[PDB]
Chain A
Amino acid sequence: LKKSVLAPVLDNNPIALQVLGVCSALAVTTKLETAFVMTLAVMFVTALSNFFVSLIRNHIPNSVRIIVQMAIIASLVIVVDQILKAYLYDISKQLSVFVGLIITNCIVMGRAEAFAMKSEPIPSFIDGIGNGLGYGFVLMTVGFFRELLGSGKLFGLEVLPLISNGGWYQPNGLMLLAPSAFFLIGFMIWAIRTFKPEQVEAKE
């Protein structure tokens, strides 16, 4: 079937249609390796948080629900960070400056609020995985352009030889700043809504 893991990639993208993961999309997308690691972390954390929130969704009072959800999310992220620091030290060094951004990524909390609080556990897990895939689509597309045009590299591998290295390419210094990410996301949304006219916002 697999009709649920693929909807939030193009039809219900968390960044292009919902506005839910923007800050890290601006932060981590200068390198494809960092974007890939962040994609995996967000997808894993959202899946597990959705599962655990749906497991106890019928016992959560409405006046402590934010506290319950955030306690679960923060505990998961902290445990993952400790495990990475103990067993995957290099990956941990990659994600160390961004660990606190994973907790406040609006995708995790928004999917727990919108879906997990009213859905079944396995569907909530699948929803988390699919929204992570849609997040990673945008992250990898933006990081491709940013890394290639700002450093002539893809995943750290030399693609465009630089003038300082005896090559011909002069890196673009605006690709190492946030405005380039803003513009790339805007043009990506333009293309997506050109191919999906149903997502065009009404003139009224």
Chain B
Amino acid sequence: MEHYISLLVKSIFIENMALSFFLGMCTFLAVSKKVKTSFGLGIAVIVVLTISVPVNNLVYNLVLKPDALVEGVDLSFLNFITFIGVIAALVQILEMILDRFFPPLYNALGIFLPLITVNCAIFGGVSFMVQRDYSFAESVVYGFGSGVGWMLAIVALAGIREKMKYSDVPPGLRGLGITFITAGLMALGFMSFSGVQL
């Protein structure tokens, strides 16, 4: 139990996907205007990561791993294309789920809904799992925790941007440039965990 709690805390705080590792930044900077939109996107990203990491764990350990099927055969050059294919199929199903049941979020996401496939944090999590040689249970916990940390990051950014309705930002900075500055200050704040081993 302590092993998995330690792994979950590490995934959420010590190796946050957004304010550490600085991954999945495009939708983090674009879709953080409203807390509720960011909350829905964070839930979707959590679901995608939590299914993707264990499925790719199984696929790597049963097919792509060296000597997994036949002695003397690698197939490890197919890792990246297999991983992105799994993620792409998942986001394909998620698209019709959101179209049927969550039209407001479907419309708010816009062109960024199909681009959840190349959210760098999800592919990076699958790659980190393969590098670290996790088990199936470790993969489930790790994908869940990475999603949770990414969602926490984007929801905090949306809360700041909502408090900033009282700000007076210069027009050349209004929106994207000030959001870039805000994310840099957030990274400063998150440098508190830099040298801890969990």
Contact = CB atoms under 8 A, between A and B. Distances in A.
Interface of A: 16-17, 19-23, 26-27, 63-64, 66-67, 70-71, 73-75, 77-78, 82, 99-101, 103-106, 108-110, 113-114, 177-183, 185-187, 189-194, 197, 200-201, 203
Interface residues of B, number: 46
Nearest to A195: B172
B114 A113 contact: yes
16 contacts: A19-B30, A22-B29, A23-B26, A26-B25, A73-B84, A82-B77, A100-B80, A108-B118, A110-B111, A113-B115, A179-B184, A179-B187, A179-B188, A186-B173, A190-B172, A193-B177
B184 A203 contact: no
B84 A74 contact: yes
Nearest to A191: B172
Given A100-B124, A103-B123, A23 B24 contact: yes
Contact of A104 (B118, B175, B177): B118
Contacts, number: 138
Contacts of A23: 22-26, 120
Interface of B: 22-27, 29-30, 77, 80-81, 84-85, 88-89, 91-92, 96, 111, 114-115, 117-120, 123-124, 127, 170-181, 183-185, 187-188, 191
Contacts of B188: 179
A25 to B, nearest CB: 9
A113 B88 CA distance: 14
A64 B92 contact: yes
